[PDB]
Amino acid sequence: TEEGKLVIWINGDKGYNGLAEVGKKFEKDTGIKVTVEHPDKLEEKFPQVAATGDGPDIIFWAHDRFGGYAQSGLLAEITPAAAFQDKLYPFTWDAVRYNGKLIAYPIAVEALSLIYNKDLLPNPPKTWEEIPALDKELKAKGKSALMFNLQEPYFTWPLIAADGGYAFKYAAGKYDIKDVGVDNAGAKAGLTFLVDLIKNKHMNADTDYSIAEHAFNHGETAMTINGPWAWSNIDTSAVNYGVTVLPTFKGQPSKPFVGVLSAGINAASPNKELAKEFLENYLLTDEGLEAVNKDKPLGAVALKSYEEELVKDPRVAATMENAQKGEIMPNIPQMSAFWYAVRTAVINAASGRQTVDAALAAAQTNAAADLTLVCSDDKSKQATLISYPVTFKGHVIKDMQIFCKNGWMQMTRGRGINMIRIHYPQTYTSVVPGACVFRGPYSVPTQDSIEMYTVSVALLWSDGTPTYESLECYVTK
Ligand SMILES: OC[C@H]1O[C@H](O[C@H]2[C@H](O)[C@@H](O)[C@@H](O)O[C@@H]2CO)[C@H](O)[C@@H](O)[C@@H]1O
């Protein structure tokens, strides 16, 4: 990256203009040009370019991605003075801590809220279960009850978690990578309710961020689910909106994943000192956070002086209320696998590509074991089992044994990708040297038209703990 300059990346839904204004100030003072960019899928792109010694000097994202970045050595250690550490809440500092070290600067606390149109809906429902009835009444008036982004599992997670779904279990002061809550009865209940909403045409499976934002901000739908950053665009619309607690599900609160917007410094940056100067003495100040927050709201900011003011904003109060009912995202590397697994499951269940159970079973195995099974509807074309580990530190799977119909075979966990072919029985290549064969077919009690094939996997963790997974493929008779 170019020395004597600063390149900053932040997501497109954020306050980049304000940040840019702060950049202008920094440039005017120090003569150092600050450039802000908002690449698409930057959370995926940053680790790719940063590994080559390229990319931005500073990267902005919620804290959950930063452990993965730190594990691969893509981030410089942050060592601020105590005086500056005092300026920010310790909670937000804890969010950016990885293996004892501070890997970023905390900026603001983010949580989803229920956003509603006061003119259409003076009293929004307090439960998910009421949305269908409400939708029927609004559909008669040429409107809909609720629209939100179904393409990102972040927005559906609050519902999935309400009845007891969870990412990784938290015991004492650390997360248990071995204990994943994607497949439990609660998660199934919540995802099932979502799919039921889609089945009854209360919502569309193809709805994304822009469609939901447009629908709500033009007054076509009575409610949406979004974060603080979204408010400024609504202010621009003609909608008088409230921001309130997410609806309960089965009598329990929705549990959004709480993010902490964080600014990391690329380990490949020559400009680190300049980045520290900018972040500490410019970006994190009443003025800088004022600029960014004015552009797009940050939620509850990490800076105490500004937060003291912000608490007066009821939208922020609603944000914090929802946050208190949710859970701070883990920052561990495995979160990358978790998010990918749940994203796939929601899209597949919502679109009708998989049942809720199958989708969440596959998501479970992917999130826990880094195992993906690519099925083919055509039995003659065999399945592919894929292992793609993202966690190389701490408790990890050391040894992996796949149990096929025809025997056991070992599979290594190294850094890279490991793929094997899984065969359906009765195929021409079913019995050949080195072939791993499915167990099945098994009859599906709900659908007579479908057959289930399965393989089992035994996992030996570095601490000696055994665990077991299974992966299924479903095929039409
Ligand atoms: O959808 C999975 C996604 O969830 C979170 O991303 C949020 C981000 O935290 C918010 O600041 C805002 O931009 O919306 C994003 C979802 O569209 C996680 O931080 C991210 O790792 C994960 O992929």
Curated annotation (Swiss-Prot):
Key words, A-Z: Periplasm, Signal, Sugar transport, Transport
Pfam family name, one: SBP_bac_1
Protein encoded by which gene: malE
A GO molecular-function annotation: carbohydrate transmembrane transporter activity
Main localization category: periplasm
Record-linked InterPro entries: Maltose/Cyclodextrin-bd, SBP, SBP_1_CS
A GO CC term attached to the entry: ATP-binding cassette (ABC) transporter complex, substrate-binding subunit-containing
Functional note: Part of the ABC transporter complex MalEFGK involved in maltose/maltodextrin import. Binds maltose and higher maltodextrins.
Subunit structure as annotated in this protein's UniProt entry: The complex is composed of two ATP-binding proteins (MalK), two transmembrane proteins (MalG and MalF) and a solute-binding protein (MalE).
Biological-process GO terms, alphabetical: maltodextrin transmembrane transport; maltose transport
Subcellular location: Periplasm
Family: Belongs to the bacterial solute-binding protein 1 family.
UniProt source species: Escherichia coli O157:H7
Protein name as it appears in the record: Maltose/maltodextrin-binding periplasmic protein
Cytoplasm among keywords: no
